[PDB]
Ligand binder design. Sequence first.
Ligand SMILES: N[C@@H](CCC(=O)N[C@@H](CS)C(=O)NCC(=O)O)C(=O)O
Ligand SMILES: N[C@@H](CCC(=O)N[C@@H](CS)C(=O)NCC(=O)O)C(=O)O
Lengths: 218, 217
Amino acid sequence: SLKLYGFSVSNYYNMVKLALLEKGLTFEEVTFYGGQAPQALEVSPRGKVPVLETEHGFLSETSVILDYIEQTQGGKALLPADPFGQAKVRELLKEIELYIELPARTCYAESFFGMSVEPLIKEKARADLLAGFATLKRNGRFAPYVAGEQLTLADLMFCFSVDLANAVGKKVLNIDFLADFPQAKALLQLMGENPHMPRILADKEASMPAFMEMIRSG
Amino acid sequence: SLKLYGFSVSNYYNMVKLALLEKGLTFEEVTFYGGQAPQALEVSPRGKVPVLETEHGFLSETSVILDYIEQTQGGKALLPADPFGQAKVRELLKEIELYIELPARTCYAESFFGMSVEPLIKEKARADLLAGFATLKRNGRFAPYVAGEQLTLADLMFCFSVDLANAVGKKVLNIDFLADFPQAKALLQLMGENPHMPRILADKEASMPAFMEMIRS
Ligand SMILES: N[C@@H](CCC(=O)N[C@@H](CS)C(=O)NCC(=O)O)C(=O)O
Ligand SMILES: N[C@@H](CCC(=O)N[C@@H](CS)C(=O)NCC(=O)O)C(=O)O
């Protein structure tokens, strides 16, 4: 009965969507843009997307949602079998989220929505991203996947964060992070050949006009 | 065996320290300040503190270290047994980290280290902290603990984040967040009565001059 609330232009939503698809699980998509409206905050407490509705109620936060799905659902494992290896996947997932996705996100207004961001914000984003990509290069195994030889949750955070982060680099900061990170470049192409990727990208394109109208409205 | 790398002034280090003490676990403390030095990056890949050393190698990131401890170690459980309840604890912990601790942290230079922060950063922190405290109010159960009737990992993130965020509020932003959040004020006093808190605070005070000296040079 799992329901995934969010929208197909959301990168964090697509991470959960890809996990569900990779694991062959049944789910219903519900269009939800989150935000600060009182009715939105009742679904998602900080107004963030995605949210997973279960028999027990709503769960928000991609990393938390993925762990819940891994614990409770069947289908292909997206973690290794040993505790320390599981924690390494989660370490890499958290590094990409905190030190690549979130800093890149501070510039998405400029890179994607045509609205310049403050110089101080770009300065901090540049430093944080340089440090984030350096952490990933140092800690990632890329064998070929982020954590080693098998697809794991960390690869979902990677493939839907590093693409946008690189676009922010080239468009906003004059830096092509992937140009000198061939391990990462190879993985991004490899994740692009995932059999569920065409579905993800098709749904994203199909959903883009409504999302942009939502933007221009508020 | 377990070694905990970091320093007792670090709030993230203290969260893991408290989890280990609360679980009755043996561990060794190793003074480590992280940073961008090559030798430090070998231990902690983003240069952050704390890091746990296990028989298998180093793990960084407090939330990750706490989960690893819960999954592998003996002692008092700091999560409920049911998987949805565990996820709700982790949601609350993540929300405190991302929406309270990290925005507050953008202002620590001023609140703690005598270095004034830019207005743009102060105004962002104000709006983020107001929202993060609202999220915690609406999602937390405070019964009396963050997630319900029992102490969990989310209370560790809470008791070592919300103290500092309130200090930022009063000193930097002219807002006392806890003044209108009685369930949180009450929880913070309860956590302060934990039998391991005096050791944590004494170690912090003892470690302060060396930390400040590292900062100066
Ligand atoms: N910490 C959240 C962040 C997710 C997030 O920032 N989602 C974006 C869409 S990709 C969002 O909810 N934006 C709408 C808003 O912030 O109001 C998570 O990990 O799931
Ligand atoms: N995401 C990290 C945050 C750790 C963190 O910011 N620790 C601080 C000390 S409390 C630190 O390593 N600061 C020194 C530095 O950034 O170089 C975690 O969750 O453990």
